[PDB]
RNA sequence: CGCGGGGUGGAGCAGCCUGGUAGCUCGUCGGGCUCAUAACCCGAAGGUCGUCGGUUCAAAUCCGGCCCCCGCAACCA
RNA sequence: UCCUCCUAAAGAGUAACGGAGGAGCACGAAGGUUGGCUAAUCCUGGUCGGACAUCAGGAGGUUAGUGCAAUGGCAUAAGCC
RNA sequence: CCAGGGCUACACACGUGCUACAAUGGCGCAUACAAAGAGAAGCGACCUCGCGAGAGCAAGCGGACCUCAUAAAGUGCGUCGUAGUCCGGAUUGGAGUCUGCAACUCGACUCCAUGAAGUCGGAAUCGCUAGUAAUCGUGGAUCAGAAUGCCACGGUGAAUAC
């Protein structure tokens, strides 16, 4: 529909549908449809608009989408500004959770290039 | 039309006691609302500008006036008298209707919306803002657009100060951080 | 407006799910349904969401109890 | 070609003893290039150790304008 | 995310910081207790965590509480 | 002094004649190949187009200046 | 050979292997006309968009333009539609 | 001798392996079938709490008797419709768990979130001829903790040798 932002496809099982909203993995998904008392088996179009509304009515709780981005992105800025070790790593675009920087770690540092 | 009346009523009086205004003419008032999309992608695709026309038209309700370049610039790889964008200088009640059709729905529909700038003003109160995508307006199929072609709209004010202009916008509530 | 150069501008009913049945002109298609409303949008309650930040000592007081 | 072990001399420490303690990672400030002249009141930077800024200079003063409690003095050791 | 119970630091640094508290404003501290985490009374202090070989000041301030001290003391000098 | 021509990747050359994208060769770097180097093989980067100014929307290019290299002339005397 | 200014001594004209620069065309619209409009360059704000696209306002005022070099002229426009 | 740091550093290079690129596949649901081990500051049922990692409880078991521990591919149904897609699982955040004085450097694991490169790899190059290769899961040593490493076990199970 127009849920929160726009995880709005169709002919996609409701759970898999809602996974596409940012900030929501399958866990939260089933937690939603179940809490909204729906059916993960359904295709969004077939789902009553009178239900989809209850889905927004559902997603209101879990922090999500843009708000989430703002929070976490703020958490990172919180760190680089903190001057903390990890903050320094983010500042260097290098692995955080202690890894082998001497070898792989290519994910963080960007694709092999230089 | 509707909130235009709202303007004619509350807004007018409210402001008369706001900026302790004298004559009714002393009140600033919306004038012309323009929509513009400097597509700039037409330089390679002439069939694309039309898509933009369909866009504004969808949001305006009236054929957008296309804009030709005013000067040639290699940095943007364009030449004189060359198409480059679509605009719509709608006014009167139409402008009003576009306004209600605007703030009441599309604005709240802004993805990741938090608030809206209170800063942006021309030095005369005339306001400016930039939408990020065409879908924010209902009428757009959303699914049928071949591309996100955000644009930006400007609202002319008969206001002189940037301040008095803002108060006019505050009359219609109209977001703002 | 010049004749036949503008899309079929027309009234439609903005039936939001929030209750605001505001019927206005546009030029969309048949009619229209919206999730929220300008009347029901948290640009006026999302404020409270924005406020609460910082305060390490407190969450620390949770990770405490002694 | 005549171009530093002095980069390891501050590592040799004893160049400073801030507010009653030595070692403290610090360095020369490019603004008041201190030397054992009229004192030094090193600023405490959030990272990179202390920013010894000679003693009395706008920057050393503007940090006062900010949050001065970060700033402290230092003798010279040797 | 470790030692769920009993946020940890140690007496030598603990007690010494306490002495630094009641004695009001204070001079830099010589701690090797990099592992220790910050606590309320540690706020605003100029404690110097011993780094890879010599101390570096860590002017703890509000936000810097939940973390361990060494986390503000980079050990690997680098390019 | 005069005339003529040229100055582009590390080297040497095209494209400049026609203004809107600087290509080839060797060399260089990475991997391979080999016990090892070469040869061979696969993949890549790399050139403020002498400099200064000018013209144009745009200058390696079109125009002038300067510096450098080079060819011709430098006659009757 | 032809055009523009300087030399040229305030009419014209006025030489040099004097100084500077152009032309050997272009267009059926860039011509005629009626109607209409008027810049450049900047400061401020504005999705992509940045020094430089498009948009809105402000200062400014022909510093713009004028098929092509210079000159004189040009808004009553000759200039732009 | 002691503390802290360091052996985990990272512009890059190579070897060796894990996991994927998906439909003979992922996913939920139901269910069938081993071997070989280890264990006394060790394995620790069942039971209760916790989404879980685990936690409180406390049998049993120094052993064909107890536990670690229900094997997994497989089988049935359902679903997913050839998309970077319910593939992929890195990376990152948040919240935790456990060990051990101690988890920042620098542990493992859980949960919530995120969801990158990859749509079968250039030149080149390796292992393998049988219950081997391939593919799946289990245990053991080392060990508080800490494997895709290694050592061992069984399941499944080919092709081709002119």
From Swiss-Prot, chain A:
Changing residue 104 to K: In PW097; partially suppresses a rimM deletion. PROSITE patterns: RIBOSOMAL_S13_1, RIBOSOMAL_S13_2. One of its GO terms (biological process) is cytoplasmic translation. Changing residue 104 to H: In PW095; partially suppresses a rimM deletion. The keyword tRNA-binding applies. Residues 93-114 are annotated as: Disordered. InterPro entries: Rbsml_uS13_C, Ribosomal_uS13, Ribosomal_uS13-like_H2TH, Ribosomal_uS13_bac-type, Ribosomal_uS13_CS. Part of the 30S ribosomal subunit. Forms a loose heterodimer with protein S19. Cross-links to the P site tRNA and weakly to the A site tRNA. Forms two bridges to the 50S subunit in the 70S ribosome, contacting the 16S rRNA and proteins S19 and L5. Located at the top of the head of the 30S subunit, it contacts several helices of the 16S rRNA. In the E.coli 70S ribosome in the initiation state was modeled to contact the 23S rRNA (bridge B1a) and protein L5 of the 50S subunit (bridge B1b), connecting the 2 subunits; bridge B1a is broken in the model with bound EF-G, while the protein-protein contacts between S13 and L5 in B1b change. The 23S rRNA contact site in bridge B1a is modeled to differ in different ribosomal states, contacting alternately S13 or S19. In the two 3.5 angstroms resolved ribosome structures the contacts between L5, S13 and S19 bridge B1b are different, confirming the dynamic nature of this interaction. Belongs to the universal ribosomal protein uS13 family.
Swiss-Prot record, chain C:
Zn(2+) binds at residue 16. InterPro entries: Ribosomal_bL28/bL31-like_sf, Ribosomal_bL31, Ribosomal_bL31_A, Ribosomal_bL31_sf. Proteolytically cleaved by protease VII to yield a peptide lacking residues 63-70. It is not clear if this is due to protein degradation or is a bona fide processing event in the strain used in PubMed:339950 and PubMed:10556732. In strains B, D10, MRE-600 and Q13 the only protein seen in PubMed:10556732 was full-length; the last 7 amino acids were sequenced only for strain MRE-600. One of its GO terms (cellular component) is cytoplasm. The keyword Electron transport does not apply. Its cofactor is Zn(2+). Disulfide bonds: none annotated. It comes from the Bacteria. Binds 1 zinc ion per subunit. Only 1 ligand appears to be Cys, the other are thought to be His and either backbone amides or solvent. GO terms for molecular function: rRNA binding; structural constituent of ribosome; zinc ion binding. The keyword Transcription does not apply. GO terms for biological process: cytoplasmic translation; negative regulation of cytoplasmic translational initiation; translation; translational initiation. The modification N6-acetyllysine is found at residue 8. Keywords: Acetylation, Metal-binding, Ribonucleoprotein, Ribosomal protein, RNA-binding, rRNA-binding, Zinc. HAMAP family: Ribosomal_bL31_1. Part of the 50S ribosomal subunit. Belongs to the bacterial ribosomal protein bL31 family. Type A subfamily. Binds the 23S rRNA. NCBIfam families: L31 (TIGR00105), PRK00019.1 (NF000612), PRK00528.1 (NF001809). This is Large ribosomal subunit protein bL31.
Curated annotation (Swiss-Prot), chain D:
Disruption phenotype: A slight increase in biofilm formation in a csrA-disrupted background; when combined with a spoT disruption (a ppGpp0 mutant) there is a very large increase in biofilm formation. The ppGpp0 mutant makes decreased levels of CsrA and its inhibitory small RNAs (sRNA) CsrB and CsrC. Deletion of relA alone decreases persister cell formation in a hipA7 mutant; the double relA/spoT deletion obviates persister cell formation. In eubacteria ppGpp (guanosine 3'-diphosphate 5'-diphosphate) is a mediator of the stringent response which coordinates a variety of cellular activities in response to changes in nutritional abundance. This enzyme catalyzes the formation of pppGpp which is then hydrolyzed to form ppGpp. The second messengers ppGpp and c-di-GMP together control biofilm formation in response to translational stress; ppGpp represses biofilm formation while c-di-GMP induces it. Belongs to the RelA/SpoT family. This is GTP pyrophosphokinase. It comes from Escherichia coli (strain K12). The chain holds residues 579 to 659 of 744 of the full protein.
Swiss-Prot record, chain E:
The keyword Ribonucleoprotein applies. One of its GO terms (biological process) is ribosomal small subunit assembly. The keyword Chaperone does not apply. GO terms for molecular function: rRNA binding; structural constituent of ribosome; tRNA binding. Pfam families: Ribosomal_S19. Keywords: Ribonucleoprotein, Ribosomal protein, RNA-binding, rRNA-binding, tRNA-binding. One of its GO terms (cellular component) is cytosolic small ribosomal subunit. InterPro entries: Ribosomal_uS19 (IPR002222), Ribosomal_uS19_bac-type (IPR005732), Ribosomal_uS19_CS (IPR020934), Ribosomal_uS19_SF (IPR023575). Transmembrane segments: none annotated. Belongs to the universal ribosomal protein uS19 family. Part of the 30S ribosomal subunit. Binds S13 and L5 and cross-links to the A site tRNA. In the E.coli 70S ribosome in the initiation state it has been modeled to contact the 23S rRNA of the 50S subunit forming part of bridge B1a; this bridge is broken in the model with bound EF-G. The 23S rRNA contact site in bridge B1a is modeled to differ in different ribosomal states, contacting alternately S13 or S19. In the 3.5 angstroms resolved ribosome structures the contacts between L5, S13 and S19 bridge B1b are different, confirming the dynamic nature of this interaction. Bridge B1a is not visible in the crystallized ribosomes due to 23S rRNA disorder. Protein S19 forms a complex with S13 that binds strongly to the 16S ribosomal RNA. Contacts the A site tRNA. This is Small ribosomal subunit protein uS19. It comes from Escherichia coli (strain K12).
